């Protein structure tokens, strides 16, 4: 065991030494101290010595961390003595830092939960300290955290013992409630509510007893008194919400239900008192209490509205809150509104009242200069409003609301900020509005285009987005296409309106491509000078995407002519030459031009030079390979690309070459003319690949490489398996696969488990075809050689290496292994189970029985699941 002088030294470093490298080292030594056996003796001494706050927190915390992890290494006799120590410690240190009192409180609770020889612990603790007024603060702290710790993932109490615990606490729930009354007769008051609230959350308090009890009255009492502090307020609110939440069935808890319902309604006055002042902390609490109230009695509001529990003052309280000038107030209620709408005529008026409240919340400040920014706190809120409106619009009628919003935009000489906000909510629903009733729909569009340029920028902006959302009305009314485009053309030519316009144009182009052939002349001219409009990269890409979608619909004759012009502006700019943006613009054209190899010839030479200039830069290469991928999406490019790929990859192992390789194999792997060339590519690509992974931490440092390598192998094993299996390179692939099984990188590991599964399955799949017997033998050889090493590796990763989310992928691989040779596998698995470093032989045996006897893959995963838990 370390010297006492050393731990006091290490502690002062960890808490005061500003250097990062030193602070880490102290941390590790103290870390190793907690794990060690010596932790108990040192901690107990540190608390008795109580030099200072730093060391006492560490000892108390360590006490807690050693009780909830290393409880097993305590002799039964020691239990009683440790309990006396902790209780003595918490006594002595009761007026020390509060953060130390909690840790000790936590420790005692964690100890009690794991000590069945300490029955009636609730009774023991109270009647020992309840009369000492200075003992009360830490007794309550223990009583608060005790029910919270029953669901502790750090303690992970067994299912049966846990059930016993909860009902044991229910037995004594009376004693603490009784105590909690004696207790309150400000700092102390909130401690009481938190404690009360905590026992509520466990769902072990008696509704009927708490229904008629002074504590409840005291709750609403302090929630009514304006004089009550913010800290007492938050505690009281939280306890109320806990009380409501604990009611699962209003009928079974009707005494409590009625007491709480009437109680919170009395707070409407207190709400108004808080909003009269600028007490935003208090109003948020009330709005929380109200929203929680309506959720609990939602059923009564619906079943028997107006009457008793269904008293419609509930919904009114929310609409009042909805009216509040502070937008942080109303979003609290959003979830209830979702839920109310979800469950759903009486409510219709309430929802349309809400919508008007949210409409005004979307109003920008009159001195706002530019466009409405989405990135900021308020632009995010507007979207949360937009989403909520979409989901509730069905309760008003998308025809009723849309028309009603537009109508109010001419009366009373509406200021610009009132117009923008109305346009915004209209845009939110403009998509869901049925295009059957076209006249009321089509007249709104005519109103927007007649708007002068003089109007506020933000009004121009939102109206462009509204038009964009109304693409289905331009599809059913093709005459408005030219006016709409022309209006959007104006916005595009204005810098701060450009991005919004380009997005809106793209929507139109996608839906109205059928008759967009005339306007293509214009679209190409925009592309010809795209970088003049000061667009965002996204808006730029989206623009070019649109024009390419309608080009594919053009007459086949003009396609080859116009496509070449669309690309020439890009090619000429690259030829002059960071090419990323033009690489990204080329790629999207190919991606959506799906009616081409004639144009591909013009593109290839400039791409090859671009690739080669920046062959060291992964980011550019990555965009380069994306481009090349879509051009293919033309055997004249195959060999010059494969060659260049292999040559660049040789010095710069960009894993995106592997992925690009996988695409060629997925697309041309079935073509037996390419199968040889593709295998050559693989065998060529693997050499610099294996070099990377052979390095120290090679798998950890290049998970991207692991991921993309086995996607390639997977494409092979599903396009031309036999080409790969008879090859010699499949053997080190498989080896690395087996090695890759311990890679904790999630993306890469899914890919590896996918290859292994698909590989082994080849010796089972499609037995109807002739070549089945060849594939059967090839896998049989492979399974003979490596089968026992795979199963041992898979079992190893499950128990020690990888997180639980891998189990379904491993189980799927294991399943395929049994399909190939179950009797052999039964032997294999026994060897894997043999080498294990605890776990009883009985557990290994019945695990083996479940897995080897599994008839569905599902059974294997559960079998692995239970066994994995043991480790």
């Amino acid at each position: 065991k370390p010297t006492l002088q050393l731990v006091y030294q290490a502690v002062q470093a960890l808490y005061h030494d500003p250097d990062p490298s030193g602070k880490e080292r102290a941390s590790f030594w103290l870390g190793e101290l907690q794990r060690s056996v010596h932790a108990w003796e040192i901690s107990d001494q540190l608390l008795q010595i109580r030099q200072d706050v730093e060391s006492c927190y560490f000892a108390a915390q360590t006490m807690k961390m050693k009780i909830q992890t290393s409880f097993y290494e305590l002799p039964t006799d020691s239990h009683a003595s440790l309990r006396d120590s902790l209780l003595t410690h918490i006594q002595n240190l009761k007026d020390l830092s509060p953060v130390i009192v909690t840790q000790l409180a936590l420790a005692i609770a964690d100890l009690a939960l794991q000590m069945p020889s300490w029955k009636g612990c609730v009774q023991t603790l109270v009647e020992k300290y309840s009369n000492d007024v200075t003992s009360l603060p830490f007794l309550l702290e223990i009583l608060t955290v005790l029910p919270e710790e029953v669901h502790s993932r750090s303690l992970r109490i067994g299912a049966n013992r846990r059930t016993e615990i909860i009902e044991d606490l229910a037995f004594y729930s009376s004693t603490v409630v009784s105590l909690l009354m004696t207790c309150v007769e400000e700092k102390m008051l909130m401690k009481v509510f938190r404690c009360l609230g905590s026992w509520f959350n466990l769902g072990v308090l008696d509704s009927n007893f708490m229904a008629n009890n002074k504590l409840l009255a005291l709750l609403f009492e302090v929630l009514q008194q304006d004089k009550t502090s913010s800290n007492l307020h938050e505690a009281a609110s939280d306890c109320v919400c806990s009380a409501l939440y604990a009611i699962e069935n209003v009928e079974t808890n009707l005494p409590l239900a009625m007491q709480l319902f009437q109680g919170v309604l009395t707070l409407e006055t207190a709400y108004h008192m808080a909003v009269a002042r600028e007490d935003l902390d208090k109003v948020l609490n009330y709005c929380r209490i109200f929203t929680e109230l309506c959720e609990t009695f939602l059923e009564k509001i619906v079943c028997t509205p107006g009457q008793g529990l269904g008293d419609l003052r509930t919904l009114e309280l929310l609409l009042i809150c909805a009216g509040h000038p502070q937008y942080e107030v109303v979003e609290i209620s959003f979830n209830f509104w979702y839920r109310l709408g979800e469950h759903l005529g009486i409510f219709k008026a309430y929802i349309q009242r809400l919508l008007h409240a949210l409409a005004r919340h979307c109003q920008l400040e009159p001195d706002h200069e530019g466009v409405p920014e989405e990135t900021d706190d308020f632009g995010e809120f507007r979207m949360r409003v937009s989403d909520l409106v979409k989901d509730l619009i069905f309760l008003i009628g998308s025809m009723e609301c849309f028309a009603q919003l537009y109508s109010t935009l001419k009366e009373g000489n509406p200021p610009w900020e009132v117009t923008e906000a109305v346009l915004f909510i209209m845009a939110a629903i403009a998509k869901s509005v049925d295009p059957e009733n076209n006249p009321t729909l089509v007249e709104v569009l005519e109103g927007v285009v007649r708007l002068p340029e003089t109007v506020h920028t933000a009004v121009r902006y939102t109206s462009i987005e509204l038009v964009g959302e109304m693409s289905e009305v331009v599809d059913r009314n093709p005459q408005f296409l030219d006016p709409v485009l022309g209006y959007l053309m104006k916005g595009l030519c204005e810098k701060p309106l450009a991005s919004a316009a380009a997005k809106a144009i793209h929507n139109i182009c996608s839906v109205c491509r059928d008759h967009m052939a005339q306007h293509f002349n214009g679209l190409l001219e925009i592309a010809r000078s795209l970088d003049s409009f000061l667009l965002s990269p996204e808006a730029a890409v989206g623009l070019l995407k649109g024009t390419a979608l309608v080009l594919a619909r053009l007459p086949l004759d003009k396609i080859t002519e116009c496509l070449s012009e669309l690309c020439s502006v890009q090619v000429m700019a690259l030829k002059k030459l960071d090419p990323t943006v033009f690489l990204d613009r080329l790629a999207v054209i190919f991606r959506h031009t799906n009616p081409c190899q004639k144009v591909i010839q013009e593109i290839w030479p400039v791409l090859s030079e671009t690739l080669n200039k920046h062959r060291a830069d992964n980011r550019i290469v990555e965009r380069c390979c994306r481009c090349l991928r879509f051009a293919v999406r033309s055997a004249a490019l195959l060999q010059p690309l494969v060659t260049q790929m292999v040559n660049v990859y040789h010095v710069h192992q960009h894993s995106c070459f592997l992925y690009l390789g996988s695409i060629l194999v997925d697309e041309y792997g079935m073509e037996e003319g390419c199968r040889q060339g593709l295998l050559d590519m693989l065998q060529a690509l693997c050499i610099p690949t294996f070099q990377l992974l052979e390095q120290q931490n090679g798998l950890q440092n290049h998970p991207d490489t692991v991921d993309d390598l086995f996607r390639l192998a997977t494409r092979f094993i599903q396009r031309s398996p036999v080409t790969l299996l008879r090859s010699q390179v499949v053997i080190p692939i498989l080896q690395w696969a087996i090695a890759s099984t311990t890679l904790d990188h999630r993306d890469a590991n899914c890919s590896v488990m996918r290859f292994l599964r698909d590989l082994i399955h080849t010796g089972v799949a499609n037995d109807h075809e002739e070549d089945f017997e060849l594939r059967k033998e090839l896998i049989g050889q492979v399974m003979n050689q490596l089968g026992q090493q795979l199963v041992s590796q898979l079992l190893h990763t499950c128990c020690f290496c990888l997180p639980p989310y891998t189990l379904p992928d491993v189980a799927e691989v294991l399943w395929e292994i049994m399909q190939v040779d179950r009797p052999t596998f039964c032997r294999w698995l026994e060897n894997s189970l043999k080498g294990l470093p605890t776990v009883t032989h009985k557990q290994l045996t019945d695990f083996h029985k479940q897995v080897t006897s599994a008839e569905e893959c599902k059974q294997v995963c559960w079998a692995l699941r239970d066994f994995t838990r043991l480790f």
Binding site: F28, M65, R153, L284, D744, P803
Partner: protein, 169 residues
Amino acid sequence: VQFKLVLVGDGGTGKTTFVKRHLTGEFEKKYVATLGVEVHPLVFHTNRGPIKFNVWDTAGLEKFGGLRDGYYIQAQCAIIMFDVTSRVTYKNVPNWHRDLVRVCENIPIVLCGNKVDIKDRKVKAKSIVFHRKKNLQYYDISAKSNYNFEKPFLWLARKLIGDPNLEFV
């Protein structure tokens, strides 16, 4: 001007990757589990003088927990990290929060949903209740795409200093 920041959250959620993004500017693909704790001073130049954050990047994996709670002493702010692509990581967010407030009460704590860049999201930004209360805040972040990757520190700075106007330069 320095602050002790404890970084907590489940393993593989992107805690260390997030720090390396600020520390070196290099996004790192690899996943190396943190052993106990890893202290990194992060200095941001602001319009009101330089601010240094003493980031305590704690380990998420139970095996490498280290002092765990012991790392929390005298923390002035915290960042709770979870995975947008992993439902089991968001389920544990309440336990992390409970641990911090048992050691550090009423400190500014930011909830961070990392890996929002992923195509298929499994944890909706709508369902989150953390930011609804005050003293607490949430930000969709991505250590890869740098989306809102500076938001948590800037927000914490405004809270620690006490100046809403403060900006990074």
